[PDB]
Nucleic acid binder design. Structure first.
Ligand SMILES: [Mg+2]
Ligand SMILES: [Mg+2]
Ligand SMILES: [Mg+2]
Ligand SMILES: [Mg+2]
Ligand SMILES: [Mg+2]
Ligand SMILES: [Mg+2]
Ligand SMILES: [Mg+2]
Lengths: 131, 185, 262, 141, 58
RNA sequence: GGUGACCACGGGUGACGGGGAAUCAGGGUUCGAUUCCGGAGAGGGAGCCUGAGAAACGGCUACCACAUCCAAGGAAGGCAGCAGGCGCGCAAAUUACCCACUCCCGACCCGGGGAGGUAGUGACGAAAAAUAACAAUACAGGACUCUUUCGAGGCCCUGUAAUUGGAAUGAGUCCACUUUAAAUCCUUUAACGAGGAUCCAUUGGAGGGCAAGUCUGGUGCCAGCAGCCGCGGUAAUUCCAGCUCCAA
């Protein structure tokens, strides 16, 4: 916080997804890489936006510390962020719950769905006994 | 299938015969003078020199004012004067063949940081670079074989985080100071 | 194989796509369309690898489903639609239109065009004939066919199709002294004036064409695309004006630009 | 003299591949008789079972008892003789052990004063013979 | 066969076992190259021994 | 009638073809199962249904060879797909996570994909690069210097052993951050982390080829070494060892 500055380059705004995307780099001389939460509050401060619609990712620290470059995408509204954004970035900010079922379990369950023909009760009940 | 690259090459060539007293003595002269780790390092820079000479030979056998010769000859000359192994007044393809291995080893970062007074010996230069105390421009380099360029020549200096530029002395210093103050009243 | 291929390998992709080996194993296999996949540019790589509007395949699909791109004035929801050559890619939300023209180095360029100049398109007639009821028909390189063409148009000529109507505004005859652009082969992306056409019966004709700098180069007849009358082009040209520079001069051009910027 | 005509390439090429059969290396590498006769079957190494321990007299100028083993290969069941190349490594060998056997070093030709032994023992009972000789690891007792 | 395998490993068994003496750790890597570079190039003395070898037993 | 010494036909192939790989004066010689393109096959043959496209095999039918369950009346097979096994061998990995990326399929902005991505085993191989540096004492060495050998120091580099002797760093422990679909690794960065810095560099050699010992003890044509010359029958520069050197 004492000596940490943010700069933005390759900035361009596209209304196609109603967002403004840019490449951001943070200059932290003596600290570690700055956390994403601090980056979002600084970027929202610079662009006069709320620090809950911002997304930052892809942060790589250069060798020897100092600068760290990532990609920052901001939006003109939160609703558009729901419309077009990767679900993992949404879940990072807590705006999207995640499925908690194993892919292997889903394949076994679906294979048991294929085994049962027609009958809805047994089709949805095939995953009950062999848990 | 997979999106891997599989693009690699060897940077060195082993000598055709082993155990020649003349060759072994000459290579050990280069290792001792420029603080090289092993014989592979002098073989790799000999190999890069040989590749440059091979390209220069092929261009020389090519006809005069050939567009391919002029373009690639000027390109190769530009790289040589950029890394400082070839004099700027000596912009000739013939003069490339006169290059040796001594001036290629001269341009290494280990040699340079010794010859700019930042290191007491060539071995002190290598261990300092490996310990990450020397930076070029704004980026700190820990590679002894970093071939420096003429533009980057003037900008070699101690890194800020090292206990030779900015603050933050090393853990040996902090531990020794702690024991000194803790060992008395 | 047993049927048509619906996959495209990344390295097997056309060179002008500028795709890289590391990102993925595959490539955007272009769907069937008005242009051959070997000479097209799929819309996905247009909005992602050229205009940087989208980042991956999912994002570029999002604009298509929001129905913002109008290839030839028609909304296309196909992510891998083969655009092709001299097509007005119009995004009216940003009010920006592009004509997909080859540059100097034989690759599709980001050629911005004014909205008024974006209402028409040049096309090369590939064959003419007469169908039922004695109706003359004409087909173009853009695969679009029109009924009732002007009888003066012969094959390998040029027509000025009009968007939103699909009619002919003007036509250009193919003869010596016309401004053309090479659309295939080594000289792809070059502009010159037709100087000579050698006819080889039973084989492909060879057309010799001279650019504005005096450099004269040959090509096949099928690679010839007339784009103007005399010396004046009928469309806006991409940067470089369709000239070809040998490796000596674009080197010092880059050095001069670096010197001026420094 | 050799024909140098501009249209003699057929005779030059036919004469080359005809005369190439007259040198040993090309003949053995393409006829296939050497491959069939090789107990290893073109393999660098091959495993076998120690039939018995044997001693072979050296050649005329030398005088020693080279320590070898008769070993039949687990593939194709051929009985061969393998040298045991150290000071006391025959003691490590014993009856009915699985031994890795390599060539001796000059491609099916006998080496040194050992008469008619083309092979040497590399590993015995899955542990390296050099490891046993230098005491890095021991026979599983 | 003659049954002369009894003598196998005779000399290696008979050789008395003397342990390796303890010595300082040898320099390795770049420092080892430095040591042998100094041992034969910077201390060159012209002597009537006809350039004795590095392992001379004199 | 057609094809053949301008090599037909036949046989062999440890032959899928090519783009390419290795070696590299030039010319050539080998290798191309292997990620790209084309072909062929799905235990061996054969015949079919549907479909635009199959002679499909994670479609069917029959025979041949194996082989599964049976209440012996019957039924069900195709891992040269990803894992994982047995066998074969000199010879080759996890019965892992995920559609986030590249794309593909679908009625489709939403579903699916052992395609593919990620991680694990991984000294096939390739790139980079630690295992130490510095200072001052002693004794040599240097064109050293001062009287012209004799002694010292106004100088330079190594060496040997030392409370030296206090500077620097990782390899590791380990916080957070970062990456990522979730992780891991890497890069940052807190706190520890070096004086046998015991935080320990090995593999092969020392007669010649071919760099390096006419050292010491044992053996005594034996054991063994030795790619080739050759060594070994009593003080073996060649074996077995110790020390010391050499090569990477
Ligand atoms: Mg075959
Ligand atoms: Mg192949
Ligand atoms: Mg098939
Ligand atoms: Mg159909
Ligand atoms: Mg079938
Ligand atoms: Mg170590
Ligand atoms: Mg010895």
């Amino acid at each position: 916080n004492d000596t940490v500055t943010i700069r933005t380059r390759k900035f361009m705004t596209n209304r196609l997804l109603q967002r403004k995307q840019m490449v951001i780099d943070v200059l932290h001389p003596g600290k570690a890489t700055v956390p994403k939460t601090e980056i979002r509050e600084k970027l929202a401060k610079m662009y006069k936006t709320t620090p809950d619609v911002i997304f930052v990712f892809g942060f790589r620290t250069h060798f020897g510390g100092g600068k760290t470059t990532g990609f920052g995408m901001i939006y003109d509204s939160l609703d558009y962020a729901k419309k077009n954004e990767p679900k993992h970035r949404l879940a990072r900010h807590g705006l999207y719950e995640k499925k908690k079922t194993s892919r292997k379990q889903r394949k076994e369950r679906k294979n048991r769905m294929k085994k049962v023909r027609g009958t809805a009760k047994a089709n949805v009940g095939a995953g009950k006994k062999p848990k | 299938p997979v999106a891997r690259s599989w693009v690699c090459r060897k940077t060195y060539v082993t000598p055709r015969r082993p155990f020649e007293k003349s060759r072994l003595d000459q290579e050990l002269k280069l290792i001792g003078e420029y603080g090289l780790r092993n014989k592979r390092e002098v073989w790799r820079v000999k190999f890069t020199l040989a590749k440059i000479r091979k390209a220069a030979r092929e261009l020389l056998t090519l006809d005069e004012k050939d567009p391919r010769r002029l373009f690639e000859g000027n390109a190769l000359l530009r790289r040589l004067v950029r890394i400082g192994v070839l004099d700027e007044g000596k912009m000739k393809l013939d003069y490339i063949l006169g290059l040796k291995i001594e001036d290629f080893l001269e341009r290494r970062l280990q040699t340079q940081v010794f010859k700019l007074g930042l290191a007491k010996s060539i071995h002190h230069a290598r261990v300092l670079i490996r310990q990450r105390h020397i930076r070029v421009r704004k980026q700190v380099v820990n590679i002894p074989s970093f071939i420096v360029r003429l533009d980057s020549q003037k900008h070699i200096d101690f890194s800020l985080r090292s206990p030779y530029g900015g603050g933050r002395p090393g853990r040996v210093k902090r531990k020794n100071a702690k024991k000194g103050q803790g060992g008395a009243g | 194989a047993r049927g048509p291929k619906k996959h495209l390998k990344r390295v097997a992709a056309p060179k002008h796509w500028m795709l890289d080996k590391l990102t993925g194993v595959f490539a955007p296999r272009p769907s069937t369309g008005p242009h051959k996949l070997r000479e097209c540019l799929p819309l996905i790589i247009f909005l992602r690898n050229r205009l940087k509007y989208a980042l991956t395949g999912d994002e570029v699909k999002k604009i298509c489903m929001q129905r913002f791109i109008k290839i030839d004035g028609k909304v296309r929801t196909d992510i891998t639609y083969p655009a092709g050559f001299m097509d007005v890619i119009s995004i009216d939300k940003t009010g920006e239109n592009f004509r997909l023209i080859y540059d100097t180095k034989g690759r599709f360029a980001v050629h911005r065009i004014t909205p008024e100049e974006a209402k028409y398109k040049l096309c090369k007639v590939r064959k003419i004939f007469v169908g039922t009821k004695g109706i003359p028909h004409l087909v173009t390189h853009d695969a679009r066919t029109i009924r009732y063409p002007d009888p003066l148009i012969k094959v390998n000529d040029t027509i000025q199709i009009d968007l939103e109507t699909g009619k002919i505004t003007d036509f250009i005859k193919f003869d010596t002294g016309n401004l053309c652009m090479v659309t295939g082969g080594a000289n792809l992306g070059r502009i010159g004036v037709i100087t000579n056409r050698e006819r080889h019966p039973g084989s492909f004709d060879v057309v010799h064409v001279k650019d504005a700098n005096g450099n004269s180069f040959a090509t096949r007849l099928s690679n010839i695309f007339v784009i103007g009358k005399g010396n004046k082009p009928w469309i806006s040209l991409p940067r470089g004006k369709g000239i070809r520079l040998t490796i000596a001069e674009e080197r010092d051009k880059r050095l001069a630009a670096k010197q001026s910027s420094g | 003299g050799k024909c140098r005509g501009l249209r003699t390439a057929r005779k030059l090429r036919s004469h080359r591949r005809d005369q190439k059969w007259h040198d040993k290396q090309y003949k053995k590498a393409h006829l296939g008789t050497a491959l069939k006769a090789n107990p290893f079957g073109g393999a660098s190494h091959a495993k076998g079972i120690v039939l018995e321990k044997v001693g072979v007299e050296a050649k005329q100028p030398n005088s020693a008892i080279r320590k070898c083993v008769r070993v039949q290969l687990i593939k194709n069941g051929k009985k061969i003789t393998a040298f045991v190349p150290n000071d006391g490594c025959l003691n490590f060998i014993e009856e009915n052990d699985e031994v890795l056997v390599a060539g001796f070093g000059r491609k099916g030709h006998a080496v040194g004063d050992i008469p008619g032994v083309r092979f040497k023992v590399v590993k015995v009972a899955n542990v390296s013979l050099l490891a046993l000789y230098k005491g890095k690891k021991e026979r599983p007792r | 066969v003659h049954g002369s395998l009894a003598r196998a490993g005779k000399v290696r068994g008979q050789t008395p076992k003397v342990a390796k003496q303890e010595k300082k750790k040898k320099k390795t890597g770049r420092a080892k190259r430095r040591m042998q570079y100094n041992r034969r190039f910077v201390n060159v003395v012209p002597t009537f021994g006809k350039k004795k070898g590095p392992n001379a037993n004199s």
